[PDB]
Amino acid sequence: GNYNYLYRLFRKSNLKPFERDISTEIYQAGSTPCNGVEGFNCYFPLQSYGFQPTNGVGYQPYRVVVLSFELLHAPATVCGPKKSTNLVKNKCVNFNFNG
Amino acid sequence: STIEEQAKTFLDKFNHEAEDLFYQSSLASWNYNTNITEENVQNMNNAGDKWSAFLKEQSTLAQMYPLQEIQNLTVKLQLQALQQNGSSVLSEDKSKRLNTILNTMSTIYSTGKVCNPDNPQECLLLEPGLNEIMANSLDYNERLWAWESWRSEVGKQLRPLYEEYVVLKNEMARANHYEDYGDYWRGDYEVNGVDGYDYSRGQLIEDVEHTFEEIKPLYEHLHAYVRAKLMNAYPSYISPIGCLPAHLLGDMWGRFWTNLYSLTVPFGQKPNIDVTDAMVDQAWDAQRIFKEAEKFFVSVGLPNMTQGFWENSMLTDPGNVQKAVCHPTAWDLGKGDFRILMCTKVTMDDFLTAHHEMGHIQYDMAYAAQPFLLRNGANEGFHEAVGEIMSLSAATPKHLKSIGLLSPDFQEDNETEINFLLKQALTIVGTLPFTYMLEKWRWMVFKGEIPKDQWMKKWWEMKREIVGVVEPVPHDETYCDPASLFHVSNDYSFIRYYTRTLYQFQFQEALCQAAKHEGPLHKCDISNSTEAGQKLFNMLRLGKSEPWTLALENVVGAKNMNVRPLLNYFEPLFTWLKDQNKNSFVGWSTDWSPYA
Ligand SMILES: *[C@@H]1O[C@H](CO)[C@@H](O)[C@H](O)[C@H]1NC(C)=O
Ligand SMILES: *[C@@H]1O[C@H](CO)[C@@H](O)[C@H](O)[C@H]1NC(C)=O
Ligand SMILES: *[C@@H]1O[C@H](CO)[C@@H](O)[C@H](O)[C@H]1NC(C)=O
Ligand SMILES: *[C@@H]1O[C@H](CO)[C@@H](O)[C@H](O)[C@H]1NC(C)=O
Ligand SMILES: *[C@@H]1O[C@H](CO)[C@@H](O)[C@H](O)[C@H]1NC(C)=O
Ligand SMILES: *[C@@H]1O[C@H](CO)[C@@H](O)[C@H](O)[C@H]1NC(C)=O
């Protein structure tokens, strides 16, 4: 079991989109608080995933990443690889240089 | 600030925790079934105890939440099962007897002994010793000794031990605020909280009895017919006016009548329908037998098996030193992991066994999306019945010709069908009285309204009346042969098999009508019909999330336990038996002649 990946099982309020929360606060079920000692109501949210080679293909840990694209006041972004061609000479040819 | 939300807040955390511990327990148990060593036994005990204790603490944490105001039906079922205190009522001293007594029973029951007293030549375990000495030999004198070799050498010492087991287990009903321990097994079929669909716990006994008066006439003709043919092997030893011996119905307990097919063949001069020689001609192997099963399911419409099964499971027996048991069992490890445990062999039963067993795995993944507590069938009978419906279709001559195992030109005559129908009747109709035979005794003994001295006299007398079996030799009270059975000795609800036959036939007609089949039920097929596939998948995915009573309405539309659509399947076989039994003595009264 690959017990190296954890996750936030519970949270008092829904997370704001694109926010990373790094806190040790424990979930509060009722009104009785916990002073750091685990009990019947502390409910430590953190839990570790268990990944084994025998896990089914549909439940394997998929390595997923997210790429964001938004426009802000900052101009002159960076795009993908612009495609360049081979130049020619002594011919009436349309040319599209950088700008 | 409501009870409904509090229950959900508790179940969700338990679901994540329960599956994590279950997965570790499930994967660990597989190693014990592959390589057994002295250090392996202790390792499994370490993991088992914590897993067993995990549910104990969770049950206490759910006690203070009242169940009288949670309108959500999904959590009511989950909370009811998780709140079973069980053995917590027993004191520390009393709690230690359960493990010790059960453990010594298992090892004692695992000691197979057929060595002749005063003649210790040799004797092996149950499977190599007991099965061969009765399925091949035809000697009455040694068969009688084999009957006493197990009921007088193993069951004799269980009289004082079985006595203490029943008297304390019956007390658990009071500790759980129940009527009797037998009533506990009836809670699965109990339905409550729905207006008009409620099923009373005591209705199960009456319904089972109410469905028995139609089984008896079929059994009366079957018993009359089988005794006539069994008389041939023993011409002058048994009179054809009484009942039949107990030790001539396939198994020692008579559960399966498969072995009687050869002895009572109608016309054995012509070759039987066997394709064993055909398989070796084409060089069939382990991979080819299972792959043909996979393409059978896709034709119906169900999704094919995942890729984490073929390369992750074992098919044949590995090595030579590995003697780990390979009993047919269904494994649902979760997270898309599914395995099959069995020792593959080139035989008719094993080929059917693989098809029969793999059906359970398919049903397991149907309700995977449900929580761990609800990750099960509607009731104990649904799981076994679902895995046998496809077996009937797989054995049809039409399906055999579809793949190509059978010859392209094979006539389907009356003789070619009676033998096939008779084979199913032996393993279906024959075992039906026996399944109700054992449960009725267990229900009354757990109730406690049976004095000690009347156990043996009542057991034999009513056996001769309903079942119709003569005792090979008189037995006194100290004998405890009914407890030697596997399910009863290990505290397993054997009633689930009684509903298996009824459930299988109820769905068989439901699936056949959904398949738009035009012909007799015995010739019905389910393959190449997406309408049947979607109908089945609709109910399988329900699992335990919905009441089992509503599941019946989704296939046949009847809320009650229907009994009519089970004899129609056997109507053909009944017709040819009626005229053949015109002169045979059908209907047996009390008989003392064989052992007067
Ligand atoms: C038993 O086999 C499993 C699986 O190969 C292995 O993990 C385990 O160490 C083995 N145990 C012993 C005692 O050989
Ligand atoms: C119970 O709660 C679950 C939570 O999602 C919901 O899906 C279901 O419909 C509810 N059932 C009833 C009967 O309230
Ligand atoms: C279960 O047993 C415990 C331990 O004695 C007891 O407190 C509880 O009331 C019992 N509950 C039921 C339903 O029997
Ligand atoms: C199972 O079915 C899917 C969908 O048709 C298919 O892509 C896949 O190849 C099948 N599996 C195998 C082993 O062919
Ligand atoms: C089912 O359809 C397949 C399609 O190729 C066919 O080969 C097979 O014979 C059919 N079987 C039945 C029983 O209709
Ligand atoms: C049914 O099969 C038997 C087998 O011998 C035959 O004698 C009989 O004529 C058949 N009946 C019909 C209607 O085909």
Coordinates of N, CA and C in Angstrom, one line a residue, chain B residues 182-375:
Chain B
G182 N -33.6 -18.5 15.8 CA -34.1 -18.8 14.5 C -34.7 -17.6 13.8
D183 N -35.4 -16.8 14.6 CA -36.0 -15.5 14.1 C -35.0 -14.5 13.6
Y184 N -33.7 -14.6 14.1 CA -32.7 -13.7 13.7 C -32.4 -13.9 12.2
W185 N -32.3 -15.1 11.7 CA -32.1 -15.4 10.3 C -33.2 -14.9 9.5
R186 N -34.4 -14.7 10.0 CA -35.6 -14.3 9.3 C -35.6 -12.7 9.1
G187 N -34.7 -12.0 9.7 CA -34.7 -10.6 9.6 C -34.3 -10.1 8.2
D188 N -33.5 -10.9 7.5 CA -33.1 -10.5 6.1 C -34.4 -10.3 5.2
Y189 N -35.3 -11.2 5.3 CA -36.6 -11.1 4.5 C -37.6 -10.2 5.1
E190 N -37.3 -9.7 6.4 CA -38.2 -8.7 7.0 C -38.2 -7.4 6.3
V191 N -39.3 -6.8 6.0 CA -39.4 -5.5 5.4 C -40.3 -4.6 6.2
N192 N -39.9 -3.4 6.6 CA -40.6 -2.5 7.4 C -40.4 -1.1 6.9
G193 N -41.3 -0.2 7.3 CA -41.2 1.2 7.0 C -41.9 1.6 5.7
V194 N -42.5 0.6 4.9 CA -43.2 0.9 3.7 C -44.7 0.4 3.9
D195 N -45.6 1.3 3.6 CA -47.0 1.0 3.8 C -47.5 0.1 2.7
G196 N -47.9 -1.1 3.1 CA -48.5 -2.1 2.2 C -47.5 -3.1 1.7
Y197 N -46.2 -2.8 1.7 CA -45.1 -3.7 1.3 C -44.4 -4.4 2.4
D198 N -44.8 -4.2 3.7 CA -44.1 -4.8 4.8 C -44.3 -6.3 4.7
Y199 N -43.2 -7.0 5.1 CA -43.1 -8.5 5.2 C -42.9 -8.9 6.6
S200 N -43.8 -9.6 7.2 CA -43.7 -10.0 8.6 C -42.7 -11.1 8.7
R201 N -41.9 -11.2 9.8 CA -40.9 -12.2 10.0 C -41.5 -13.6 10.1
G202 N -42.7 -13.7 10.7 CA -43.3 -15.0 10.8 C -44.0 -15.4 9.5
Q203 N -44.2 -14.5 8.5 CA -44.8 -14.9 7.3 C -43.9 -15.8 6.5
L204 N -42.6 -15.8 6.7 CA -41.6 -16.7 6.0 C -41.9 -18.2 6.2
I205 N -42.2 -18.5 7.5 CA -42.5 -19.9 7.7 C -43.8 -20.4 7.0
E206 N -44.8 -19.6 7.1 CA -46.1 -19.9 6.5 C -46.0 -19.9 5.0
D207 N -45.2 -18.9 4.4 CA -45.1 -18.9 3.0 C -44.3 -20.1 2.5
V208 N -43.3 -20.5 3.2 CA -42.5 -21.7 2.8 C -43.4 -22.9 2.8
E209 N -44.2 -23.0 3.9 CA -45.2 -24.1 4.0 C -46.3 -24.0 2.9
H210 N -46.7 -22.8 2.6 CA -47.7 -22.5 1.6 C -47.3 -22.9 0.2
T211 N -45.9 -22.9 0.0 CA -45.4 -23.3 -1.3 C -44.9 -24.7 -1.3
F212 N -45.2 -25.5 -0.3 CA -44.7 -26.9 -0.2 C -45.8 -27.9 -0.7
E213 N -47.1 -27.5 -0.6 CA -48.1 -28.5 -1.0 C -48.1 -28.7 -2.5
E214 N -47.5 -27.8 -3.3 CA -47.4 -28.1 -4.7 C -46.1 -28.8 -5.0
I215 N -45.1 -28.8 -4.2 CA -43.9 -29.5 -4.4 C -44.1 -31.0 -4.2
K216 N -44.9 -31.4 -3.2 CA -45.1 -32.8 -2.8 C -45.6 -33.6 -3.9
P217 N -46.6 -33.3 -4.7 CA -47.0 -34.2 -5.8 C -45.9 -34.5 -6.8
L218 N -45.1 -33.5 -7.1 CA -44.0 -33.7 -8.0 C -43.0 -34.7 -7.3
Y219 N -42.7 -34.5 -6.0 CA -41.8 -35.4 -5.3 C -42.4 -36.8 -5.2
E220 N -43.7 -36.9 -5.1 CA -44.3 -38.2 -4.9 C -44.0 -39.1 -6.2
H221 N -44.2 -38.5 -7.4 CA -43.9 -39.2 -8.6 C -42.4 -39.5 -8.8
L222 N -41.6 -38.5 -8.4 CA -40.2 -38.7 -8.5 C -39.7 -39.8 -7.6
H223 N -40.2 -39.8 -6.4 CA -39.8 -40.9 -5.5 C -40.2 -42.3 -6.0
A224 N -41.4 -42.3 -6.6 CA -41.9 -43.6 -7.1 C -41.1 -44.0 -8.3
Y225 N -40.7 -43.1 -9.2 CA -40.0 -43.5 -10.4 C -38.6 -43.9 -10.0
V226 N -37.9 -43.2 -9.2 CA -36.5 -43.5 -8.9 C -36.3 -44.8 -8.2
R227 N -37.3 -45.2 -7.3 CA -37.2 -46.4 -6.6 C -37.3 -47.6 -7.5
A228 N -38.1 -47.5 -8.6 CA -38.3 -48.6 -9.5 C -37.0 -48.9 -10.2
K229 N -36.3 -47.9 -10.7 CA -35.0 -48.1 -11.3 C -33.9 -48.5 -10.4
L230 N -33.9 -47.9 -9.1 CA -32.9 -48.3 -8.1 C -33.0 -49.8 -7.7
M231 N -34.2 -50.4 -7.9 CA -34.5 -51.7 -7.5 C -33.6 -52.7 -8.3
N232 N -33.2 -52.3 -9.5 CA -32.4 -53.2 -10.4 C -31.1 -53.7 -9.8
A233 N -30.4 -52.7 -9.2 CA -29.1 -53.1 -8.6 C -29.2 -54.0 -7.4
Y234 N -30.4 -54.0 -6.7 CA -30.6 -54.8 -5.5 C -32.0 -55.5 -5.7
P235 N -32.0 -56.6 -6.5 CA -33.3 -57.2 -6.8 C -34.1 -57.7 -5.6
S236 N -33.4 -58.6 -4.8 CA -34.1 -59.3 -3.7 C -33.8 -58.7 -2.3
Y237 N -33.1 -57.5 -2.3 CA -32.7 -56.9 -1.0 C -33.7 -55.9 -0.5
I238 N -34.4 -55.2 -1.4 CA -35.3 -54.1 -1.0 C -36.7 -54.4 -1.7
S239 N -37.8 -54.3 -1.0 CA -39.1 -54.5 -1.6 C -39.5 -53.2 -2.2
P240 N -40.2 -53.2 -3.4 CA -40.7 -52.0 -4.0 C -42.1 -51.6 -3.5
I241 N -42.2 -51.6 -2.2 CA -43.5 -51.1 -1.6 C -43.2 -50.1 -0.5
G242 N -42.0 -50.0 0.0 CA -41.6 -49.1 1.0 C -40.8 -47.9 0.4
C243 N -40.0 -47.3 1.3 CA -39.2 -46.1 1.0 C -37.8 -46.6 0.5
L244 N -36.9 -45.7 0.4 CA -35.6 -46.0 -0.1 C -34.5 -45.7 1.0
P245 N -33.4 -46.4 0.9 CA -32.3 -46.1 1.9 C -31.7 -44.7 1.8
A246 N -31.1 -44.2 2.8 CA -30.6 -42.9 2.9 C -29.2 -42.8 2.1
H247 N -28.5 -43.9 2.0 CA -27.1 -43.9 1.5 C -27.1 -44.3 0.0
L248 N -28.2 -44.0 -0.8 CA -28.2 -44.3 -2.2 C -28.8 -43.1 -3.0
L249 N -28.6 -41.9 -2.5 CA -29.1 -40.7 -3.1 C -28.0 -39.7 -3.5
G250 N -26.9 -40.2 -4.1 CA -25.8 -39.4 -4.5 C -24.8 -39.1 -3.5
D251 N -25.2 -38.3 -2.5 CA -24.3 -37.9 -1.4 C -24.7 -38.6 -0.1
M252 N -23.8 -38.5 0.9 CA -24.1 -39.2 2.2 C -25.3 -38.5 2.8
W253 N -25.4 -37.2 2.7 CA -26.6 -36.5 3.2 C -27.7 -36.3 2.1
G254 N -27.5 -36.8 0.9 CA -28.5 -36.7 -0.1 C -28.7 -35.3 -0.7
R255 N -27.8 -34.4 -0.4 CA -28.0 -33.1 -0.9 C -28.0 -33.0 -2.5
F256 N -27.1 -33.8 -3.1 CA -27.0 -33.8 -4.6 C -27.3 -35.2 -5.1
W257 N -28.1 -35.3 -6.1 CA -28.4 -36.6 -6.7 C -27.8 -36.8 -8.0
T258 N -26.6 -36.2 -8.2 CA -25.9 -36.2 -9.5 C -25.5 -37.6 -9.9
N259 N -24.9 -38.3 -8.9 CA -24.4 -39.6 -9.2 C -25.4 -40.7 -9.6
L260 N -26.7 -40.4 -9.4 CA -27.7 -41.4 -9.7 C -28.1 -41.4 -11.2
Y261 N -27.6 -40.4 -12.0 CA -27.9 -40.4 -13.4 C -27.4 -41.6 -14.1
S262 N -26.1 -42.0 -13.8 CA -25.6 -43.2 -14.5 C -26.3 -44.5 -14.1
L263 N -26.7 -44.6 -12.8 CA -27.3 -45.8 -12.4 C -28.7 -46.0 -12.9
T264 N -29.4 -44.9 -13.2 CA -30.8 -45.0 -13.7 C -30.9 -44.4 -15.1
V265 N -29.9 -44.7 -16.0 CA -30.0 -44.3 -17.4 C -31.2 -44.9 -18.1
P266 N -32.0 -44.1 -18.8 CA -33.1 -44.8 -19.5 C -32.7 -45.8 -20.6
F267 N -31.8 -45.4 -21.5 CA -31.4 -46.3 -22.6 C -29.9 -45.9 -22.8
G268 N -29.0 -46.7 -22.2 CA -27.6 -46.5 -22.3 C -26.8 -47.2 -23.4
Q269 N -27.5 -47.9 -24.2 CA -26.9 -48.6 -25.4 C -26.2 -47.5 -26.3
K270 N -27.0 -46.5 -26.6 CA -26.4 -45.4 -27.5 C -25.5 -44.5 -26.7
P271 N -24.5 -43.9 -27.3 CA -23.6 -43.0 -26.6 C -24.3 -41.8 -26.0
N272 N -23.9 -41.4 -24.8 CA -24.4 -40.2 -24.2 C -23.9 -38.9 -24.9
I273 N -24.4 -37.8 -24.5 CA -24.0 -36.5 -25.0 C -22.7 -36.0 -24.3
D274 N -21.6 -36.4 -24.8 CA -20.3 -36.1 -24.2 C -19.4 -35.5 -25.2
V275 N -18.8 -34.3 -24.8 CA -17.9 -33.6 -25.7 C -16.5 -33.6 -25.1
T276 N -16.2 -34.4 -24.1 CA -14.8 -34.4 -23.5 C -13.8 -34.8 -24.6
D277 N -14.0 -35.8 -25.4 CA -13.1 -36.2 -26.4 C -13.0 -35.1 -27.5
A278 N -14.0 -34.3 -27.7 CA -14.0 -33.2 -28.7 C -13.0 -32.1 -28.2
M279 N -13.0 -31.8 -26.9 CA -12.1 -30.7 -26.4 C -10.7 -31.1 -26.6
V280 N -10.3 -32.3 -26.3 CA -8.9 -32.7 -26.5 C -8.5 -32.7 -28.0
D281 N -9.4 -33.0 -28.9 CA -9.1 -33.0 -30.3 C -8.7 -31.6 -30.8
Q282 N -9.3 -30.6 -30.3 CA -9.0 -29.2 -30.7 C -7.9 -28.6 -29.7
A283 N -7.4 -29.4 -28.8 CA -6.4 -28.9 -27.8 C -6.9 -27.7 -27.1
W284 N -8.0 -27.8 -26.3 CA -8.5 -26.8 -25.5 C -7.5 -26.6 -24.2
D285 N -7.3 -25.4 -23.8 CA -6.5 -25.1 -22.7 C -7.2 -24.2 -21.7
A286 N -6.5 -23.8 -20.6 CA -7.1 -22.9 -19.6 C -7.6 -21.6 -20.2
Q287 N -6.7 -21.0 -21.0 CA -7.1 -19.7 -21.5 C -8.3 -19.7 -22.5
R288 N -8.4 -20.8 -23.2 CA -9.5 -20.9 -24.2 C -10.9 -21.2 -23.6
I289 N -10.9 -21.9 -22.5 CA -12.2 -22.2 -21.8 C -12.8 -20.9 -21.2
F290 N -11.9 -20.1 -20.6 CA -12.4 -18.9 -20.0 C -12.7 -17.8 -21.0
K291 N -12.0 -17.7 -22.1 CA -12.2 -16.7 -23.1 C -13.6 -16.9 -23.8
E292 N -13.9 -18.1 -24.0 CA -15.3 -18.4 -24.6 C -16.4 -17.9 -23.6
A293 N -16.1 -18.0 -22.3 CA -17.1 -17.5 -21.4 C -17.3 -16.0 -21.5
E294 N -16.2 -15.3 -21.7 CA -16.2 -13.8 -21.8 C -17.0 -13.4 -22.9
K295 N -16.8 -14.0 -24.1 CA -17.6 -13.6 -25.3 C -19.0 -14.0 -25.2
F296 N -19.4 -14.8 -24.3 CA -20.8 -15.1 -24.1 C -21.5 -14.0 -23.4
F297 N -20.9 -13.3 -22.5 CA -21.5 -12.2 -21.8 C -21.6 -11.0 -22.6
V298 N -20.6 -10.7 -23.5 CA -20.7 -9.5 -24.4 C -21.9 -9.7 -25.4
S299 N -22.1 -10.9 -25.8 CA -23.2 -11.1 -26.7 C -24.5 -10.8 -26.0
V300 N -24.7 -11.1 -24.8 CA -25.9 -10.7 -24.0 C -26.0 -9.2 -24.0
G301 N -24.9 -8.5 -23.7 CA -24.9 -7.1 -23.6 C -24.1 -6.5 -22.4
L302 N -23.7 -7.4 -21.5 CA -23.0 -7.0 -20.3 C -21.5 -6.6 -20.7
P303 N -20.9 -5.7 -20.0 CA -19.5 -5.4 -20.3 C -18.6 -6.5 -20.1
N304 N -17.5 -6.5 -20.8 CA -16.5 -7.6 -20.7 C -15.6 -7.4 -19.4
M305 N -14.9 -8.4 -19.1 CA -14.1 -8.4 -17.8 C -13.0 -7.4 -18.0
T306 N -12.5 -6.8 -16.9 CA -11.4 -5.9 -16.9 C -10.1 -6.6 -17.1
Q307 N -9.1 -5.8 -17.5 CA -7.8 -6.3 -17.8 C -7.0 -6.7 -16.5
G308 N -7.5 -6.3 -15.3 CA -6.8 -6.5 -14.1 C -7.1 -7.9 -13.5
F309 N -7.8 -8.7 -14.3 CA -8.2 -10.1 -13.8 C -7.4 -11.2 -14.5
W310 N -7.3 -11.1 -15.8 CA -6.6 -12.2 -16.6 C -5.2 -12.3 -16.1
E311 N -4.5 -11.2 -16.0 CA -3.0 -11.2 -15.7 C -2.8 -11.2 -14.1
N312 N -3.9 -11.1 -13.3 CA -3.7 -11.0 -11.9 C -4.2 -12.3 -11.2
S313 N -5.1 -13.1 -11.8 CA -5.6 -14.3 -11.2 C -4.9 -15.5 -11.6
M314 N -5.2 -16.6 -10.9 CA -4.6 -17.9 -11.1 C -5.7 -18.9 -11.6
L315 N -5.3 -19.7 -12.6 CA -6.2 -20.7 -13.2 C -5.9 -22.1 -12.8
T316 N -4.7 -22.6 -13.0 CA -4.3 -23.9 -12.8 C -3.6 -24.0 -11.4
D317 N -3.3 -25.2 -11.0 CA -2.7 -25.4 -9.7 C -1.2 -25.1 -9.8
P318 N -0.6 -24.2 -9.1 CA 0.8 -23.8 -9.2 C 1.7 -24.7 -8.4
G319 N 2.8 -25.1 -9.1 CA 3.8 -25.9 -8.4 C 3.3 -27.3 -8.0
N320 N 4.0 -27.9 -7.1 CA 3.7 -29.2 -6.5 C 3.6 -29.2 -5.0
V321 N 4.5 -28.4 -4.4 CA 4.5 -28.3 -2.9 C 3.3 -27.5 -2.4
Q322 N 2.7 -26.7 -3.2 CA 1.6 -25.8 -2.7 C 0.3 -26.7 -2.7
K323 N 0.0 -27.0 -1.4 CA -1.2 -27.8 -1.2 C -2.4 -27.0 -0.6
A324 N -2.4 -25.7 -0.9 CA -3.4 -24.8 -0.3 C -4.8 -25.2 -0.9
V325 N -5.8 -25.1 -0.1 CA -7.1 -25.5 -0.6 C -7.6 -24.5 -1.6
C326 N -8.3 -25.0 -2.7 CA -8.8 -24.3 -3.8 C -10.3 -24.5 -3.9
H327 N -11.0 -24.4 -2.8 CA -12.4 -24.6 -2.9 C -13.1 -23.5 -3.7
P328 N -14.1 -23.8 -4.5 CA -14.8 -22.7 -5.3 C -15.4 -21.6 -4.4
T329 N -14.9 -20.4 -4.5 CA -15.4 -19.3 -3.8 C -15.3 -18.1 -4.6
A330 N -16.2 -17.1 -4.3 CA -16.2 -15.8 -5.0 C -15.5 -14.7 -4.2
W331 N -14.6 -14.1 -4.9 CA -13.8 -13.0 -4.2 C -14.1 -11.7 -4.9
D332 N -14.5 -10.7 -4.0 CA -14.7 -9.3 -4.4 C -13.9 -8.4 -3.5
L333 N -12.6 -8.2 -4.0 CA -11.7 -7.4 -3.3 C -12.0 -5.9 -3.3
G334 N -12.8 -5.5 -4.3 CA -13.1 -4.1 -4.5 C -12.0 -3.3 -5.2
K335 N -12.3 -2.1 -5.6 CA -11.3 -1.2 -6.3 C -11.0 -1.9 -7.7
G336 N -12.0 -2.5 -8.3 CA -11.8 -3.2 -9.6 C -11.0 -4.4 -9.5
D337 N -10.7 -5.0 -8.4 CA -9.9 -6.2 -8.2 C -10.9 -7.4 -8.0
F338 N -10.9 -8.4 -8.9 CA -11.7 -9.6 -8.9 C -10.9 -10.8 -9.3
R339 N -11.0 -11.8 -8.5 CA -10.2 -13.0 -8.7 C -11.1 -14.3 -8.6
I340 N -10.6 -15.4 -9.1 CA -11.3 -16.7 -9.1 C -10.4 -17.7 -8.5
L341 N -10.9 -18.4 -7.5 CA -10.2 -19.4 -6.7 C -10.8 -20.8 -7.0
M342 N -10.0 -21.6 -7.7 CA -10.5 -23.0 -8.0 C -9.3 -23.7 -8.7
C343 N -9.4 -25.1 -8.6 CA -8.4 -25.9 -9.3 C -9.0 -26.4 -10.6
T344 N -8.6 -25.8 -11.7 CA -9.2 -26.1 -13.0 C -8.9 -27.6 -13.4
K345 N -9.9 -28.2 -14.0 CA -9.7 -29.6 -14.5 C -10.6 -29.8 -15.8
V346 N -10.3 -30.7 -16.6 CA -11.0 -31.0 -17.8 C -12.1 -32.0 -17.5
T347 N -13.2 -31.4 -17.0 CA -14.4 -32.2 -16.6 C -15.6 -31.4 -16.8
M348 N -16.8 -32.1 -17.0 CA -18.0 -31.4 -17.2 C -18.4 -30.5 -16.0
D349 N -18.3 -31.1 -14.8 CA -18.7 -30.3 -13.6 C -17.8 -29.1 -13.4
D350 N -16.5 -29.2 -13.6 CA -15.6 -28.1 -13.4 C -15.9 -27.0 -14.5
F351 N -16.1 -27.4 -15.7 CA -16.5 -26.4 -16.7 C -17.8 -25.7 -16.3
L352 N -18.8 -26.4 -15.8 CA -20.0 -25.7 -15.3 C -19.7 -25.0 -14.0
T353 N -18.8 -25.5 -13.2 CA -18.5 -24.8 -11.9 C -17.9 -23.5 -12.2
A354 N -17.0 -23.4 -13.2 CA -16.3 -22.1 -13.5 C -17.4 -21.1 -14.0
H355 N -18.3 -21.6 -14.8 CA -19.4 -20.7 -15.3 C -20.3 -20.3 -14.1
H356 N -20.6 -21.3 -13.3 CA -21.5 -21.0 -12.1 C -20.8 -20.0 -11.2
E357 N -19.5 -20.2 -10.9 CA -18.8 -19.4 -9.9 C -18.6 -17.9 -10.5
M358 N -18.3 -17.8 -11.7 CA -18.0 -16.5 -12.3 C -19.2 -15.6 -12.3
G359 N -20.4 -16.1 -12.2 CA -21.6 -15.3 -12.2 C -21.7 -14.5 -10.9
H360 N -21.2 -15.0 -9.8 CA -21.2 -14.3 -8.5 C -20.3 -13.1 -8.6
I361 N -19.2 -13.2 -9.3 CA -18.3 -12.0 -9.4 C -19.0 -10.9 -10.2
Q362 N -19.7 -11.3 -11.3 CA -20.4 -10.2 -12.1 C -21.4 -9.5 -11.2
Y363 N -22.1 -10.2 -10.4 CA -23.1 -9.6 -9.5 C -22.5 -8.7 -8.5
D364 N -21.3 -9.1 -8.0 CA -20.6 -8.3 -7.0 C -20.3 -6.9 -7.5
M365 N -19.8 -6.7 -8.8 CA -19.5 -5.4 -9.3 C -20.8 -4.7 -9.7
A366 N -21.9 -5.3 -9.8 CA -23.2 -4.6 -10.2 C -23.5 -3.5 -9.2
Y367 N -23.3 -3.8 -7.9 CA -23.6 -2.8 -6.8 C -22.4 -2.2 -6.2
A368 N -21.3 -2.1 -7.0 CA -20.1 -1.6 -6.4 C -20.2 -0.1 -6.0
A369 N -21.0 0.7 -6.8 CA -21.1 2.1 -6.4 C -21.8 2.3 -5.1
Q370 N -22.5 1.3 -4.6 CA -23.2 1.4 -3.3 C -22.1 1.4 -2.2
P371 N -22.5 1.9 -1.0 CA -21.5 1.9 0.1 C -21.2 0.5 0.5
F372 N -20.1 0.4 1.4 CA -19.6 -0.9 1.7 C -20.7 -1.7 2.5
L373 N -21.5 -1.1 3.4 CA -22.5 -1.8 4.1 C -23.6 -2.3 3.2
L374 N -24.0 -1.5 2.2 CA -25.0 -1.9 1.2 C -24.4 -2.7 0.0
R375 N -23.1 -2.9 0.0 CA -22.4 -3.6 -1.1 C -22.7 -5.1 -0.9

